[PDB]
Amino acid sequence: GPGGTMAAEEMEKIFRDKLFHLHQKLDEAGKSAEEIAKAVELFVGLAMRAFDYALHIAERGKEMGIPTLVEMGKILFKYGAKLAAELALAGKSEEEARAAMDRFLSLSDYLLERLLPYIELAERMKSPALQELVLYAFKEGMKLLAELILAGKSDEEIQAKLDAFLAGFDVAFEFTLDIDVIGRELDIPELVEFALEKGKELVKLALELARAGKSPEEVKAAVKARGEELHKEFEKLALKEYFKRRLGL
Amino acid sequence: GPGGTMAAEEMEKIFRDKLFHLHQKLDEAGKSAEEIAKAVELFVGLAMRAFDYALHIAERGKEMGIPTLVEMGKILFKYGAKLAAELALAGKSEEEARAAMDRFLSLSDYLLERLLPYIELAERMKSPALQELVLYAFKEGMKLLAELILAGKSDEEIQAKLDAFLAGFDVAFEFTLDIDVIGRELDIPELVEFALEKGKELVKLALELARAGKSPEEVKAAVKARGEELHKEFEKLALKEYFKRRLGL
Ligand SMILES: [Zn+2]
Ligand SMILES: [Zn+2]
Ligand SMILES: [Zn+2]
Ligand SMILES: [Zn+2]
């Protein structure tokens, strides 16, 4: 639109894109005109609520000193619009779609509350890598939450899976922070890149374990083992880069 | 004249115009004074009945919340006055002209009852394009009905033709609604204009097929094929407009 916010324009673009591709999918599926109209109106109804909630999150982030909350609200709206598109495409009635959207928003708030301290710690140390890791973890959690809500699961199983995912993310965050501090102090960008990449890998492993139904302890143990292997790789890379710098290479 | 209502003034103007041009046509044809007088009185007698019928229909529409019924009553009066003018020009006696006017009024009521649910559905979705489509369909139906009544056809062939025309109009309405919903939700007026234009084209095709004497199934099939072609054209236009909007063009 002509007059809006820097975060509202991106969400409007996402909404238009999702609406266009939802119409494309409905046309491909070969539905009647009234069914297409019902699906479009249902999608607009759900996406309006998702837009309101994400805009509230982004505004709350803008009021305080956390630029990460704006990006995380954008991620939330993207995945809420995605969930709304699948809800409209599946032919769910209005009541079930509204209930599913409410549960999705509540569980996204749960993940928000659990992830805020990591954002504060990352922004205290001025580490872009840690902020990117938190963004990636939120994105993966949103993916898992949307898939679980689509599959029709209870609010307790989803919370347990989120708890296991956060248990894994704690270890991933510790690994990334440990590598990134020494990478920034020694002035070697390769170490920071390695930290970010291997932290993303650890977050992916934690999410995959959480989806499989493992308890938080199992996720913690497996992520710790993978982090130990990646730490050996980091030791090798750090030695190589340090001796590249030391010899003038 | 003075006073009256908003809808009766336009009907009075139509009546005066038709009377004036009927007198011009009678003078051009070179008829005797008594023949001109009898044609004029016959036309006035038929047009008064048409005026009363259309005024009722318009009043019934105004009492409810359907502005479309007023416009369709005006359309009915216009074509009833046209039929009366042709009947007076042909020199038919009062009995045959009165019977023909009666049959025309009954068949216009038949078409009105068949078209009412589409008006209700269009008003429920608040779609000006669908209301315009219904108005156009009623206008074409009145044209065909006047032509058939002038041609001297029974009250069975006319009903069969009307059913075929309505069978085509169902597909035309579905196509127009399908395009119009997505055009309105994405806020692209070109899509709504395309919907209206191609729905009018489909209605014209359905009327042409009904005039030729085809069964409703053949009309349905042909209108469906033409709608598929127009749907491919709509897909092209929608992609072009969406990429114009997305790129800021
Ligand atoms: Zn709000
Ligand atoms: Zn370390
Ligand atoms: Zn009367
Ligand atoms: Zn379509």
PDB file of C-alpha atoms in Angstrom, chain A:
ATOM      1  CA  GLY A   1       0.000   0.000   0.000  1.00  0.00           C
ATOM      2  CA  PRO A   2       0.920   3.684  -0.263  1.00  0.00           C
ATOM      3  CA  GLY A   3       1.267   4.393   3.449  1.00  0.00           C
ATOM      4  CA  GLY A   4       2.445   1.719   5.860  1.00  0.00           C
ATOM      5  CA  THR A   5       5.300   0.363   7.976  1.00  0.00           C
ATOM      6  CA  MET A   6       8.561  -1.159   6.775  1.00  0.00           C
ATOM      7  CA  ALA A   7       7.476  -4.461   8.352  1.00  0.00           C
ATOM      8  CA  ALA A   8       3.860  -4.236   7.157  1.00  0.00           C
ATOM      9  CA  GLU A   9       4.811  -3.929   3.472  1.00  0.00           C
ATOM     10  CA  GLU A  10       6.761  -7.204   3.540  1.00  0.00           C
ATOM     11  CA  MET A  11       3.818  -8.950   5.199  1.00  0.00           C
ATOM     12  CA  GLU A  12       1.451  -7.478   2.602  1.00  0.00           C
ATOM     13  CA  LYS A  13       3.673  -8.855  -0.166  1.00  0.00           C
ATOM     14  CA  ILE A  14       3.660 -12.269   1.530  1.00  0.00           C
ATOM     15  CA  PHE A  15      -0.140 -12.148   1.800  1.00  0.00           C
ATOM     16  CA  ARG A  16      -0.586 -11.270  -1.878  1.00  0.00           C
ATOM     17  CA  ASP A  17       1.844 -13.996  -2.965  1.00  0.00           C
ATOM     18  CA  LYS A  18       0.113 -16.632  -0.832  1.00  0.00           C
ATOM     19  CA  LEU A  19      -3.322 -15.592  -2.107  1.00  0.00           C
ATOM     20  CA  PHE A  20      -2.205 -15.768  -5.745  1.00  0.00           C
ATOM     21  CA  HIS A  21      -0.629 -19.198  -5.345  1.00  0.00           C
ATOM     22  CA  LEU A  22      -3.606 -20.472  -3.335  1.00  0.00           C
ATOM     23  CA  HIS A  23      -5.859 -19.504  -6.234  1.00  0.00           C
ATOM     24  CA  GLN A  24      -3.454 -21.275  -8.599  1.00  0.00           C
ATOM     25  CA  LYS A  25      -3.554 -24.452  -6.490  1.00  0.00           C
ATOM     26  CA  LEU A  26      -7.352 -24.332  -6.222  1.00  0.00           C
ATOM     27  CA  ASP A  27      -7.601 -23.977 -10.003  1.00  0.00           C
ATOM     28  CA  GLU A  28      -5.208 -26.903 -10.484  1.00  0.00           C
ATOM     29  CA  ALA A  29      -7.233 -29.084  -8.100  1.00  0.00           C
ATOM     30  CA  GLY A  30     -10.333 -28.569 -10.261  1.00  0.00           C
ATOM     31  CA  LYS A  31     -12.899 -27.177  -7.825  1.00  0.00           C
ATOM     32  CA  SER A  32     -16.220 -25.447  -8.374  1.00  0.00           C
ATOM     33  CA  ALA A  33     -16.501 -21.663  -8.287  1.00  0.00           C
ATOM     34  CA  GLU A  34     -18.353 -21.598  -4.958  1.00  0.00           C
ATOM     35  CA  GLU A  35     -15.732 -23.858  -3.360  1.00  0.00           C
ATOM     36  CA  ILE A  36     -12.989 -21.542  -4.627  1.00  0.00           C
ATOM     37  CA  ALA A  37     -14.815 -18.524  -3.190  1.00  0.00           C
ATOM     38  CA  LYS A  38     -15.242 -20.288   0.161  1.00  0.00           C
ATOM     39  CA  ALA A  39     -11.557 -21.235   0.274  1.00  0.00           C
ATOM     40  CA  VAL A  40     -10.471 -17.698  -0.624  1.00  0.00           C
ATOM     41  CA  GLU A  41     -12.683 -16.106   2.032  1.00  0.00           C
ATOM     42  CA  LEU A  42     -11.479 -18.609   4.648  1.00  0.00           C
ATOM     43  CA  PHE A  43      -7.850 -17.894   3.758  1.00  0.00           C
ATOM     44  CA  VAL A  44      -8.393 -14.137   4.006  1.00  0.00           C
ATOM     45  CA  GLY A  45     -10.132 -14.549   7.360  1.00  0.00           C
ATOM     46  CA  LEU A  46      -7.297 -16.594   8.853  1.00  0.00           C
ATOM     47  CA  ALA A  47      -4.491 -14.541   7.306  1.00  0.00           C
ATOM     48  CA  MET A  48      -5.965 -11.333   8.731  1.00  0.00           C
ATOM     49  CA  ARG A  49      -5.626 -12.716  12.266  1.00  0.00           C
ATOM     50  CA  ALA A  50      -2.108 -13.970  11.536  1.00  0.00           C
ATOM     51  CA  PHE A  51      -1.211 -10.531  10.144  1.00  0.00           C
ATOM     52  CA  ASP A  52      -2.571  -8.783  13.240  1.00  0.00           C
ATOM     53  CA  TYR A  53      -0.648 -11.052  15.608  1.00  0.00           C
ATOM     54  CA  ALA A  54       2.628 -10.759  13.682  1.00  0.00           C
ATOM     55  CA  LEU A  55       2.268  -6.978  13.418  1.00  0.00           C
ATOM     56  CA  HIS A  56       1.749  -6.797  17.182  1.00  0.00           C
ATOM     57  CA  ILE A  57       4.945  -8.807  17.697  1.00  0.00           C
ATOM     58  CA  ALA A  58       6.908  -6.601  15.286  1.00  0.00           C
ATOM     59  CA  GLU A  59       5.614  -3.415  16.928  1.00  0.00           C
ATOM     60  CA  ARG A  60       6.530  -4.757  20.373  1.00  0.00           C
ATOM     61  CA  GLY A  61      10.024  -5.473  19.077  1.00  0.00           C
ATOM     62  CA  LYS A  62      10.299  -1.982  17.597  1.00  0.00           C
ATOM     63  CA  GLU A  63       9.182  -0.313  20.841  1.00  0.00           C
ATOM     64  CA  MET A  64      11.992  -1.952  22.817  1.00  0.00           C
ATOM     65  CA  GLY A  65      15.544  -2.417  21.566  1.00  0.00           C
ATOM     66  CA  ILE A  66      15.316  -5.801  19.838  1.00  0.00           C
ATOM     67  CA  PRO A  67      15.484  -5.651  16.022  1.00  0.00           C
ATOM     68  CA  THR A  68      15.342  -9.468  16.040  1.00  0.00           C
ATOM     69  CA  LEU A  69      11.676  -9.473  17.087  1.00  0.00           C
ATOM     70  CA  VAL A  70      10.715  -7.716  13.840  1.00  0.00           C
ATOM     71  CA  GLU A  71      12.272 -10.462  11.713  1.00  0.00           C
ATOM     72  CA  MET A  72      10.745 -13.095  13.977  1.00  0.00           C
ATOM     73  CA  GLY A  73       7.293 -11.550  13.574  1.00  0.00           C
ATOM     74  CA  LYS A  74       7.808 -11.641   9.810  1.00  0.00           C
ATOM     75  CA  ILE A  75       8.710 -15.342  10.070  1.00  0.00           C
ATOM     76  CA  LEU A  76       5.604 -15.929  12.182  1.00  0.00           C
ATOM     77  CA  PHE A  77       3.359 -14.265   9.613  1.00  0.00           C
ATOM     78  CA  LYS A  78       4.953 -16.199   6.755  1.00  0.00           C
ATOM     79  CA  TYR A  79       4.254 -19.531   8.418  1.00  0.00           C
ATOM     80  CA  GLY A  80       0.799 -18.477   9.613  1.00  0.00           C
ATOM     81  CA  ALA A  81      -0.148 -17.537   6.060  1.00  0.00           C
ATOM     82  CA  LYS A  82       1.254 -20.891   4.933  1.00  0.00           C
ATOM     83  CA  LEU A  83      -0.871 -22.742   7.510  1.00  0.00           C
ATOM     84  CA  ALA A  84      -3.925 -20.715   6.501  1.00  0.00           C
ATOM     85  CA  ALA A  85      -3.349 -21.616   2.849  1.00  0.00           C
ATOM     86  CA  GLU A  86      -3.234 -25.330   3.667  1.00  0.00           C
ATOM     87  CA  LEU A  87      -6.299 -24.998   5.910  1.00  0.00           C
ATOM     88  CA  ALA A  88      -8.237 -23.368   3.067  1.00  0.00           C
ATOM     89  CA  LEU A  89      -6.978 -25.931   0.544  1.00  0.00           C
ATOM     90  CA  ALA A  90      -7.919 -28.888   2.759  1.00  0.00           C
ATOM     91  CA  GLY A  91     -11.587 -27.868   2.828  1.00  0.00           C
ATOM     92  CA  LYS A  92     -11.781 -27.462   6.603  1.00  0.00           C
ATOM     93  CA  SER A  93     -14.827 -25.645   7.927  1.00  0.00           C
ATOM     94  CA  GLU A  94     -14.584 -22.178   9.448  1.00  0.00           C
ATOM     95  CA  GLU A  95     -14.791 -23.319  13.080  1.00  0.00           C
ATOM     96  CA  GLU A  96     -11.965 -25.863  12.872  1.00  0.00           C
ATOM     97  CA  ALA A  97      -9.798 -23.450  10.878  1.00  0.00           C
ATOM     98  CA  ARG A  98     -10.297 -20.711  13.478  1.00  0.00           C
ATOM     99  CA  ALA A  99      -9.515 -23.109  16.331  1.00  0.00           C
ATOM    100  CA  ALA A 100      -6.375 -24.357  14.569  1.00  0.00           C
ATOM    101  CA  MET A 101      -5.204 -20.790  13.963  1.00  0.00           C
ATOM    102  CA  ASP A 102      -5.784 -19.958  17.637  1.00  0.00           C
ATOM    103  CA  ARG A 103      -3.735 -22.970  18.754  1.00  0.00           C
ATOM    104  CA  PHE A 104      -0.983 -22.069  16.278  1.00  0.00           C
ATOM    105  CA  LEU A 105      -0.792 -18.512  17.622  1.00  0.00           C
ATOM    106  CA  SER A 106      -0.736 -19.697  21.243  1.00  0.00           C
ATOM    107  CA  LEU A 107       2.061 -22.202  20.634  1.00  0.00           C
ATOM    108  CA  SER A 108       4.028 -19.620  18.649  1.00  0.00           C
ATOM    109  CA  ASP A 109       3.750 -17.353  21.694  1.00  0.00           C
ATOM    110  CA  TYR A 110       5.046 -20.251  23.803  1.00  0.00           C
ATOM    111  CA  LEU A 111       8.096 -20.623  21.550  1.00  0.00           C
ATOM    112  CA  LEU A 112       8.560 -16.831  21.630  1.00  0.00           C
ATOM    113  CA  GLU A 113       8.648 -16.832  25.427  1.00  0.00           C
ATOM    114  CA  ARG A 114      11.147 -19.687  25.493  1.00  0.00           C
ATOM    115  CA  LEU A 115      13.399 -18.042  22.879  1.00  0.00           C
ATOM    116  CA  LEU A 116      13.489 -14.468  24.231  1.00  0.00           C
ATOM    117  CA  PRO A 117      16.362 -14.979  26.761  1.00  0.00           C
ATOM    118  CA  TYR A 118      18.607 -16.286  23.981  1.00  0.00           C
ATOM    119  CA  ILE A 119      17.854 -13.142  21.972  1.00  0.00           C
ATOM    120  CA  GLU A 120      18.795 -10.990  24.963  1.00  0.00           C
ATOM    121  CA  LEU A 121      22.043 -12.905  25.508  1.00  0.00           C
ATOM    122  CA  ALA A 122      22.934 -12.753  21.805  1.00  0.00           C
ATOM    123  CA  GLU A 123      22.300  -9.005  21.603  1.00  0.00           C
ATOM    124  CA  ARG A 124      24.298  -8.385  24.785  1.00  0.00           C
ATOM    125  CA  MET A 125      27.436  -9.838  23.163  1.00  0.00           C
ATOM    126  CA  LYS A 126      26.902  -8.097  19.782  1.00  0.00           C
ATOM    127  CA  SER A 127      27.099 -11.415  17.931  1.00  0.00           C
ATOM    128  CA  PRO A 128      25.344 -11.484  14.529  1.00  0.00           C
ATOM    129  CA  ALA A 129      25.971 -15.237  14.294  1.00  0.00           C
ATOM    130  CA  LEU A 130      24.009 -15.924  17.482  1.00  0.00           C
ATOM    131  CA  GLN A 131      21.120 -13.753  16.277  1.00  0.00           C
ATOM    132  CA  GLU A 132      21.077 -15.642  12.972  1.00  0.00           C
ATOM    133  CA  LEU A 133      21.076 -18.910  14.926  1.00  0.00           C
ATOM    134  CA  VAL A 134      18.085 -17.755  16.986  1.00  0.00           C
ATOM    135  CA  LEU A 135      16.281 -16.726  13.791  1.00  0.00           C
ATOM    136  CA  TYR A 136      16.967 -20.145  12.254  1.00  0.00           C
ATOM    137  CA  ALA A 137      15.744 -21.926  15.387  1.00  0.00           C
ATOM    138  CA  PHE A 138      12.527 -19.901  15.338  1.00  0.00           C
ATOM    139  CA  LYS A 139      12.039 -20.726  11.649  1.00  0.00           C
ATOM    140  CA  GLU A 140      12.483 -24.457  12.275  1.00  0.00           C
ATOM    141  CA  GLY A 141      10.151 -24.333  15.271  1.00  0.00           C
ATOM    142  CA  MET A 142       7.530 -22.575  13.157  1.00  0.00           C
ATOM    143  CA  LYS A 143       7.868 -25.251  10.466  1.00  0.00           C
ATOM    144  CA  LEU A 144       7.420 -28.043  13.009  1.00  0.00           C
ATOM    145  CA  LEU A 145       4.510 -26.292  14.733  1.00  0.00           C
ATOM    146  CA  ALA A 146       2.657 -25.648  11.472  1.00  0.00           C
ATOM    147  CA  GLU A 147       3.124 -29.259  10.369  1.00  0.00           C
ATOM    148  CA  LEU A 148       1.923 -30.589  13.736  1.00  0.00           C
ATOM    149  CA  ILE A 149      -1.129 -28.307  13.769  1.00  0.00           C
ATOM    150  CA  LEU A 150      -1.961 -29.435  10.229  1.00  0.00           C
ATOM    151  CA  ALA A 151      -1.616 -33.089  11.257  1.00  0.00           C
ATOM    152  CA  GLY A 152      -4.221 -32.562  13.989  1.00  0.00           C
ATOM    153  CA  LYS A 153      -2.258 -33.148  17.190  1.00  0.00           C
ATOM    154  CA  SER A 154      -3.087 -32.265  20.776  1.00  0.00           C
ATOM    155  CA  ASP A 155      -1.653 -29.212  22.523  1.00  0.00           C
ATOM    156  CA  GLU A 156       0.390 -31.407  24.898  1.00  0.00           C
ATOM    157  CA  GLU A 157       2.300 -33.435  22.297  1.00  0.00           C
ATOM    158  CA  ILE A 158       3.231 -30.239  20.450  1.00  0.00           C
ATOM    159  CA  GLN A 159       4.493 -28.676  23.683  1.00  0.00           C
ATOM    160  CA  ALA A 160       6.561 -31.784  24.449  1.00  0.00           C
ATOM    161  CA  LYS A 161       8.105 -31.708  20.966  1.00  0.00           C
ATOM    162  CA  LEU A 162       8.878 -28.001  21.376  1.00  0.00           C
ATOM    163  CA  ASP A 163      10.506 -28.730  24.743  1.00  0.00           C
ATOM    164  CA  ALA A 164      12.747 -31.373  23.165  1.00  0.00           C
ATOM    165  CA  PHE A 165      13.641 -29.007  20.317  1.00  0.00           C
ATOM    166  CA  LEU A 166      14.580 -26.273  22.798  1.00  0.00           C
ATOM    167  CA  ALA A 167      16.662 -28.761  24.790  1.00  0.00           C
ATOM    168  CA  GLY A 168      18.646 -29.432  21.620  1.00  0.00           C
ATOM    169  CA  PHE A 169      18.842 -25.737  20.758  1.00  0.00           C
ATOM    170  CA  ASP A 170      20.439 -24.981  24.132  1.00  0.00           C
ATOM    171  CA  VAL A 171      23.422 -27.181  23.240  1.00  0.00           C
ATOM    172  CA  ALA A 172      23.535 -25.791  19.697  1.00  0.00           C
ATOM    173  CA  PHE A 173      23.588 -22.223  21.047  1.00  0.00           C
ATOM    174  CA  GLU A 174      26.356 -23.060  23.522  1.00  0.00           C
ATOM    175  CA  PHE A 175      28.479 -24.607  20.755  1.00  0.00           C
ATOM    176  CA  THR A 176      27.993 -21.634  18.431  1.00  0.00           C
ATOM    177  CA  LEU A 177      28.719 -19.092  21.177  1.00  0.00           C
ATOM    178  CA  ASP A 178      31.877 -20.908  22.284  1.00  0.00           C
ATOM    179  CA  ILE A 179      33.261 -20.950  18.748  1.00  0.00           C
ATOM    180  CA  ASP A 180      32.112 -17.428  17.851  1.00  0.00           C
ATOM    181  CA  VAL A 181      33.709 -15.682  20.842  1.00  0.00           C
ATOM    182  CA  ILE A 182      37.198 -16.927  19.972  1.00  0.00           C
ATOM    183  CA  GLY A 183      36.505 -16.414  16.269  1.00  0.00           C
ATOM    184  CA  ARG A 184      35.724 -12.738  16.828  1.00  0.00           C
ATOM    185  CA  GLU A 185      38.566 -12.141  19.290  1.00  0.00           C
ATOM    186  CA  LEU A 186      41.230 -13.712  17.056  1.00  0.00           C
ATOM    187  CA  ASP A 187      39.910 -11.808  13.992  1.00  0.00           C
ATOM    188  CA  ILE A 188      39.293 -14.853  11.794  1.00  0.00           C
ATOM    189  CA  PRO A 189      35.983 -14.715   9.861  1.00  0.00           C
ATOM    190  CA  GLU A 190      36.322 -18.364   8.809  1.00  0.00           C
ATOM    191  CA  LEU A 191      35.844 -19.410  12.437  1.00  0.00           C
ATOM    192  CA  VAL A 192      32.633 -17.368  12.671  1.00  0.00           C
ATOM    193  CA  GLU A 193      31.350 -18.889   9.422  1.00  0.00           C
ATOM    194  CA  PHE A 194      32.137 -22.373  10.745  1.00  0.00           C
ATOM    195  CA  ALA A 195      30.347 -21.533  13.999  1.00  0.00           C
ATOM    196  CA  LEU A 196      27.199 -20.402  12.191  1.00  0.00           C
ATOM    197  CA  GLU A 197      27.140 -23.343   9.768  1.00  0.00           C
ATOM    198  CA  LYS A 198      27.708 -26.014  12.411  1.00  0.00           C
ATOM    199  CA  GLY A 199      25.218 -24.381  14.768  1.00  0.00           C
ATOM    200  CA  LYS A 200      22.628 -24.515  11.998  1.00  0.00           C
ATOM    201  CA  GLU A 201      23.509 -28.185  11.485  1.00  0.00           C
ATOM    202  CA  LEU A 202      23.062 -28.858  15.213  1.00  0.00           C
ATOM    203  CA  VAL A 203      19.700 -27.055  15.210  1.00  0.00           C
ATOM    204  CA  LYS A 204      18.591 -29.169  12.242  1.00  0.00           C
ATOM    205  CA  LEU A 205      19.616 -32.345  14.073  1.00  0.00           C
ATOM    206  CA  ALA A 206      17.761 -31.224  17.205  1.00  0.00           C
ATOM    207  CA  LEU A 207      14.599 -30.505  15.209  1.00  0.00           C
ATOM    208  CA  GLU A 208      14.818 -33.864  13.429  1.00  0.00           C
ATOM    209  CA  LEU A 209      15.159 -35.634  16.780  1.00  0.00           C
ATOM    210  CA  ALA A 210      12.255 -33.663  18.267  1.00  0.00           C
ATOM    211  CA  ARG A 211      10.010 -34.573  15.331  1.00  0.00           C
ATOM    212  CA  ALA A 212      10.786 -38.275  15.847  1.00  0.00           C
ATOM    213  CA  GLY A 213       9.318 -38.119  19.365  1.00  0.00           C
ATOM    214  CA  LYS A 214      12.461 -38.414  21.491  1.00  0.00           C
ATOM    215  CA  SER A 215      12.559 -37.042  25.022  1.00  0.00           C
ATOM    216  CA  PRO A 216      14.564 -33.864  25.736  1.00  0.00           C
ATOM    217  CA  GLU A 217      17.337 -35.903  27.385  1.00  0.00           C
ATOM    218  CA  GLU A 218      17.915 -38.004  24.257  1.00  0.00           C
ATOM    219  CA  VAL A 219      17.988 -34.873  22.092  1.00  0.00           C
ATOM    220  CA  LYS A 220      20.471 -33.253  24.475  1.00  0.00           C
ATOM    221  CA  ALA A 221      22.742 -36.310  24.438  1.00  0.00           C
ATOM    222  CA  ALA A 222      22.762 -36.719  20.656  1.00  0.00           C
ATOM    223  CA  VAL A 223      23.265 -33.003  19.999  1.00  0.00           C
ATOM    224  CA  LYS A 224      26.122 -33.040  22.521  1.00  0.00           C
ATOM    225  CA  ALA A 225      27.818 -35.933  20.710  1.00  0.00           C
ATOM    226  CA  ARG A 226      27.453 -34.230  17.331  1.00  0.00           C
ATOM    227  CA  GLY A 227      28.790 -31.018  18.860  1.00  0.00           C
ATOM    228  CA  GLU A 228      31.832 -32.876  20.171  1.00  0.00           C
ATOM    229  CA  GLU A 229      32.599 -34.159  16.671  1.00  0.00           C
ATOM    230  CA  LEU A 230      32.093 -30.687  15.199  1.00  0.00           C
ATOM    231  CA  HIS A 231      34.351 -29.279  17.927  1.00  0.00           C
ATOM    232  CA  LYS A 232      37.135 -31.615  16.828  1.00  0.00           C
ATOM    233  CA  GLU A 233      36.612 -30.313  13.291  1.00  0.00           C
ATOM    234  CA  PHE A 234      36.728 -26.765  14.680  1.00  0.00           C
ATOM    235  CA  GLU A 235      40.024 -27.491  16.427  1.00  0.00           C
ATOM    236  CA  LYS A 236      41.525 -28.647  13.132  1.00  0.00           C
ATOM    237  CA  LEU A 237      40.218 -25.609  11.237  1.00  0.00           C
ATOM    238  CA  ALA A 238      41.330 -23.183  13.959  1.00  0.00           C
ATOM    239  CA  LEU A 239      44.854 -24.613  13.970  1.00  0.00           C
ATOM    240  CA  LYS A 240      45.030 -24.353  10.176  1.00  0.00           C
ATOM    241  CA  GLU A 241      43.798 -20.747  10.100  1.00  0.00           C
ATOM    242  CA  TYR A 242      46.017 -19.671  12.999  1.00  0.00           C
ATOM    243  CA  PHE A 243      49.112 -21.050  11.289  1.00  0.00           C
ATOM    244  CA  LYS A 244      48.030 -19.436   8.023  1.00  0.00           C
ATOM    245  CA  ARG A 245      47.917 -16.076   9.817  1.00  0.00           C
ATOM    246  CA  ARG A 246      51.077 -16.599  11.882  1.00  0.00           C
ATOM    247  CA  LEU A 247      53.356 -17.390   8.927  1.00  0.00           C
ATOM    248  CA  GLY A 248      52.107 -14.409   6.915  1.00  0.00           C
ATOM    249  CA  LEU A 249      50.244 -16.705   4.510  1.00  0.00           C
TER     250      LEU A 249
END
